[PDB]
């Protein structure tokens, strides 16, 4: 029996491959050959934030485009005013090994988690002036790799178990358990309209998940190695994925296929974060060799380098107003670029 | 106008946070973090929900022991969280060829580009309970054992037969082969024979964590 299902699976896989090949009527690098190159994008280290004791593992900008959360394995979340370098709060974590953070579209709540298998939802705007854990979402059977708010009420979380979950924070229960990945779902990014998200995993696949239906809509398979990072293109119709294969790739949901590969032969280091500028035109990728490289998303060509980190860039984030790029690193500093 | 009031309030909150973080920096720097990683965890813990935490002190030195439970077997993504522990405490049972699997896990721990600069304190546990090996299968899984004499630098405790002083030293030689062949100056491996009853292993953890920190400082002064 099992061999019959293997053969049928291979037949469907070759159907999908043939369909993709038939629908690859053009190539992106050829369609946009005449677009004007961006020249060189020399970004200034306009602020450096020096609060964390240990390696920063995640950071996230608020919708206000001014405040950021940063999470470090010292067990502190720090909320930074990027206009002033002032720390607004620092929050002690019950487990020092945080691996993800997120900050709600309202700015009321901040999320964090890591090897504790728990997502911790902190309230920043409680009247008591302290910051206290509003909920500990604990039904995960492995480390939390990413967290992203859909609203103050709902958080999607990604695990080192092969599953993601949509949590209702007041219920404390996972209302859906997106299941079908075959490895650790390292990275998570929500669509600009929060009806879909795409998750990138240690099976070289990224999968597009319907938050309301819970089904897996599409599997994108081009990568050679673990997808450490994923980000939607601000249109909601494409996303980019970074991998240990030292490549970023741009996937289009409606073409169902890889439109571009971003690589350079002197890059052997894996990608640790990917984000897009507000136009989408620039892809910013963080790398293991303590650098960030900025890519023309429509040309697959380099545009600039954010140097001056001492150690692995762990998190990268572009403000919603597009004004600045944050880059956290194992050097324990956030550097904000503009 | 309110801009000055806001700036003053924000700077006061910042000063409180600076005070807290500066106070916690000394506690973080004083506490040695240890990753406990089993390929005999009870023997190496009882004598000294996700990640699990044992917090203890030796000679007023704070040690913080982290056991990675309820994580799936694919270590490659989470183990990078521990590039800044003082030691990876690798407990291997003398005891599938669990020695080979433990040894390949240790080789991967050693060579991984982020886990360099983390030393390994290698407790060969259960060296009584199975390594007594009084059978009238180390010889079967490791055929090169037939060519290995017990070393001249062997320092036994009596009551262990030469069968055990062969077995345990051969296993140590295998781990030290992995250690020596691919690491110099940046990370060190401290083998320790240990047993289900043999307590005061915590003292050897302390002694080798101290050695790690001493070697770090000598490394910074460029003296080694």
């Amino acid at each position: 029996e099992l061999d019959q299902l293997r053969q049928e699976a291979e037949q469907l896989k070759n159907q999908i491959r043939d369909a993709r090949k038939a629908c690859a009527d053009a190539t992106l690098s050829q369609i946009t050959n005449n677009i004007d190159p961006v020249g060189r994008i020399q970004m200034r280290t306009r602020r450096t934030l020096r609060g964390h004791l240990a390696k920063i593992y995640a950071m996230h900008w608020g919708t206000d485009s001014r405040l950021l959360v940063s999470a470090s394995q010292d067990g502190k979340l720090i909320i930074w005013d990027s206009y002033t370098t002032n720390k607004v709060h620092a929050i002690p974590l019950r487990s020092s090994w945080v691996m993800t953070c997120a900050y709600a579209p309202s700015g009321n709540y901040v999320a964090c988690g890591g090897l504790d298998n728990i997502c911790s939802i902190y309230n920043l705007k409680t009247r008591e002036g302290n910051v206290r854990v509003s909920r500990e979402l604990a039904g995960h059977t492995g480390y939390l790799s990413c967290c992203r708010f859909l609203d103050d009420n709902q958080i999607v979380t990604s695990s080192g178990d092969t599953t993601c979950a949509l949590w209702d924070i007041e219920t404390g229960q996972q209302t859906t358990t997106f299941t079908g990945h075959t490895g650790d779902v390292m990275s998570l990014s929500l669509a600009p309209d929060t009806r879909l998200f795409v998750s990138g995993a240690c099976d070289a696949s990224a999968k597009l998940w319907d938050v309301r239906e819970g089904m897996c809509r599409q599997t994108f398979t081009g990568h050679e190695s673990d997808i450490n990072a994923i980000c939607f293109f601000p249109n909601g119709n494409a996303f980019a994925t970074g991998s240990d294969d030292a490549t970023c790739r741009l996937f289009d949901l409606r073409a169902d296929q890889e439109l571009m590969t971003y690589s350079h032969d002197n890059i052997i280091c894996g990608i640790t974060s990917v984000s897009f500028s507000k136009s989408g035109r620039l892809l910013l990728a963080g790398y293991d060799d303590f650098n960030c490289n900025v890519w023309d998303a429509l040309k697959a060509d380099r545009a600039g380098v954010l140097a001056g980190h001492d150690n692995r860039v762990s998190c990268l984030g572009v403000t919603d107003d597009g004004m600045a790029v944050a880059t956290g690193s194992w050097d324990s500093f956030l550097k904000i670029w503009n | 106008e309110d801009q000055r009031n806001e700036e003053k309030a924000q700077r006061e909150a910042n000063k409180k946070i600076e005070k807290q973080l500066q106070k916690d920096k000394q506690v973080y720097r004083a506490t040695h973090r240890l990753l406990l990683l089993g390929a005999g965890k009870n023997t190496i813990v009882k004598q000294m929900s996700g990640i699990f935490e044992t917090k203890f002190q030796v000679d007023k030195v704070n040690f913080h022991m982290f056991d990675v439970g309820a994580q799936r077997d694919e270590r490659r993504k989470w183990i990078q969280c521990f590039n800044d522990v003082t030691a990876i405490i690798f407990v291997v049972a003398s005891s599938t060829n669990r020695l080979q699997a433990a040894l390949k896990l240790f080789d991967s721990i050693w060579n991984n580009k982020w886990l360099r600069d983390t030393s390994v304190i290698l407790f060969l546990n259960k060296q009584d309970l199975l390594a007594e090996k009084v059978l009238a299968k180390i010889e079967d899984y490791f055929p090169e054992f037939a060519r290995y004499t017990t070393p001249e630098d062997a320092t036994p405790e009596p009551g262990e037969d030469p069968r055990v002083t062969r077995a345990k030293y051969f296993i140590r030689d295998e781990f030290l082969r992995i250690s020596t062949a691919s690491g110099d100056g940046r990370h060190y491996c401290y083998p320790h024979f240990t047993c289900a009853v043999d307590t005061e292993n915590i003292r050897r953890v302390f002694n080798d964590c101290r050695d790690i920190i001493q070697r770090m400082h000598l490394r910074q002064y460029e003296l080694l």
Partner: nanobody
Amino acid sequence: QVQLQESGGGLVQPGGSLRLSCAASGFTFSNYKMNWVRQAPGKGLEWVSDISQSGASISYTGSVKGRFTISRDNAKNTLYLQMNSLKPEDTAVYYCARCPAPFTRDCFDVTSTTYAYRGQGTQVTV
């Protein structure tokens, strides 16, 4: 997709010789070390042999040293495991397994029941 497909005879006499081959696809074969893993009936997976990027660094599990011989053909994305004097204990499903990351020296790939980057296996029975 990253794909590995093993081949090699399901049944053989004791003392026989056999050759496994794995066709690799979807990854830059020259960049990744390759491992062989096996699963005996009712037991966990165990590492059998490994081969570095160039085929320079090679090692074996001790019950296999000299009885098998590993080689890799970087020209055709093909990994081989030669077998001689197959013993009853070598009766297993044999899985081809790839290091998770290019250019690295480490691997974490024996993980039972779950791992990408590892093939469907070919039976050997003695």
